[PDB]
Amino acid sequence: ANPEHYIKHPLQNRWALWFFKWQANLRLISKFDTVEDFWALYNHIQLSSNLMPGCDYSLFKDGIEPMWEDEKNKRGGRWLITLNKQQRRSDLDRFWLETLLCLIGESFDDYSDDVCGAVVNVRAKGDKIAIWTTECENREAVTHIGRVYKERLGLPPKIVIGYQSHADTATTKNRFVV
Amino acid sequence: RYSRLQLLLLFR
Ligand SMILES: [Cl-]
Numbered sequence A: 001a002n003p004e005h006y007i008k009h010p011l012q013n014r015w016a017l018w019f020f021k022w023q024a025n026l027r028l029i030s031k032f033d034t035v036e037d038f039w040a041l042y043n044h045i046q047l048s049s050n051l052m053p054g055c056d057y058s059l060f061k062d063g064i065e066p067m068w069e070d071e072k073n074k075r076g077g078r079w080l081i082t083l084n085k086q087q088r089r090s091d092l093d094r095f096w097l098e099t100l101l102c103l104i105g106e107s108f109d110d111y112s113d114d115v116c117g118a119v120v121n122v123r124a125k126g127d128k129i130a131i132w133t134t135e136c137e138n139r140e141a142v143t144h145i146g147r148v149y150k151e152r153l154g155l156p157p158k159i160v161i162g163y164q165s166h167a168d169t170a171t172t173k174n175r176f177v178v
Numbered sequence B: 001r002y003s004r005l006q007l008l009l010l011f012r
Helices: A035-044 A087-104 A109-114 A139-153 A166-170 B004-009
Strands: A010-020 A026-034 A055-061 A077-082 A115-122 A128-133 A162-165
Touching: A010 A035, A010 A087, A026 A035, A035 A087, A035 B004, A055 A087, A077 A139, A077 A166, A087 A115, A087 A128, A087 A139, A087 B004, A109 A115, A109 A139, A128 A139, A162 A166
Parallel strands: none
Antiparallel strands: A010 A026, A010 A055, A055 A115, A077 A128, A077 A162, A115 A128
């Protein structure tokens, strides 16, 4: 039966979508905490592939700013996916959507609590996507998140991805690899 | 809470 009042399906966490065009240029677009509200937001906004050079989207848990200096990010780091310039057409939007689904779906088992959010950088040199985690020394969590994320994106067996601490990016060698 | 399948199922 189609009810007169449809009840949405609540997500484990509330999420906030951000847009970058330094801390002046950040802008909170929208927040959501149901699956249906996620889809309504995703359906309405521009694809990452259609953004201007130097823009970012970020999706982070409610109350975490998408910046190194936030308390949940300070000690953390990121699993970085680097795309080449040709991959903008074939892979960018596809990888970004799947990243969003890994986040809102809590796809990393017990270690989804370590996940702070994700960022996509739209750049002329080549696009970048990253999952940001809260603590770079949580080796078991960082390792599990990396393996699952890489395999969810369907990245070639040949290529390796790397985890950088935000500390080493701020002063970059890989702290972990999968 | 939700599998990948369930998230997509709820895109209407
Ligand atoms: Cl994919």
